[PDB]
Structure 1
Amino acid sequence: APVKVWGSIKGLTEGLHGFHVHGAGGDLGNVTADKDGVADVSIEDSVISLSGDHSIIGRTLVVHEKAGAGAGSRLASGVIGIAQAGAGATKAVAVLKGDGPVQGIINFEQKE
């Protein structure tokens, strides 16, 4: 089942920011921060999973603080933690923390 990935990250520079789960199979894409430094996230991803031998639970989620595809970026990061779910679903949450104002909350959900 696809994993739904959603939430927001704040305190970013305007533009495109690389958005990855650490390790294999983790290149989620990018988030786009507006003129206020706020990036809304709403992604569906059928490559990642919240269960099985390649579950992303306990892996680190990162966002590049440097905008664009350039080198030498610092990261905001947080560990993907288990959240309590209702029947037939798995849920997880990563609390991202970086430098200065960079912070966010990203939710993950997958039907069981």
Structure 2
Amino acid sequence: ATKAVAVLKGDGPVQGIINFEQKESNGPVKVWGSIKGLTEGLHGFWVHGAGGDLGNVTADKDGVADVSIEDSVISLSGDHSIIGRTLVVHEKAGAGAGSRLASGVIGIAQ
């Protein structure tokens, strides 16, 4: 089964791993991961280049904002592929200003 993984990196301690599931074109691809480091708050996470729609995430007291979205016909490939994409987490979603703190390109994990 073809899978993918992308790690986040910014100030240093901030991390963010996102695993994917792509067995076949017929099979969907659900996105999910966990961003640790930052503190409780809001950090709009998404994938620039591939929809860029992955809702927002709220950090925890320990400093971990779990991420969970729905699967699409992307199939981790094709026109709607998210392999090698560019991830970016805003400083504080809700306003709509725009800023780049961390980043983590997607990479097939087989």
- Shorter chain as denominator, the TM-score bin is 0.5 to 0.7
SS of 2:76's partner is: coil
CA 28–72 in structure 1, closer or farther in 2 if over 3 Å, else same: closer
RMSD: 2.0
- C-alpha separation in 1, matches of 2:105 and 2:39: 22
1:107 matched residue in structure 2 = none
Question: Is the contact between residue 26 and residue 48 of structure 1 (CA under 8 Å) also seen in structure 2?
Answer: no
1:63 matched residue in structure 2 = 89
Question: Is the contact between residue 14 and residue 67 of structure 1 (CA under 8 Å) also seen in structure 2?
Answer: no
Residue 53 of structure 2 is aligned to residue 27 of structure 1: yes
What runs of 5+ residues in structure 1 fail to find an aligned partner?
85-112
Structure 1 runs of 4+ aligned residues shifted over 6 Å read none
TM-score, scaled relative to structure 2: 0.63
Shift of 1:48: 4.2
Q: How many residues align?
A: 83
CA 18–82 in structure 1, closer or farther in 2 if over 3 Å, else same: same
Greater strand content? 1
2:31 matched residue in structure 1 = 5
**Identity over the aligned pairs, expressed in percent?**
92
Shift of 1:54: 2.4
- C-alpha separation in 2, matches of 1:31 and 1:44: 14
Amino acid at match of 2:86: T
Shift of 1:40: 1.3
What per-residue deviation string (whole Å, max 9, x for no partner) do you get for residues 14-70 of structure 1?
122111111251211111111222111232232644011221111112222x12323
What runs of 5+ residues in structure 2 fail to find an aligned partner?
1-26
1:73 matched residue in structure 2 = 99
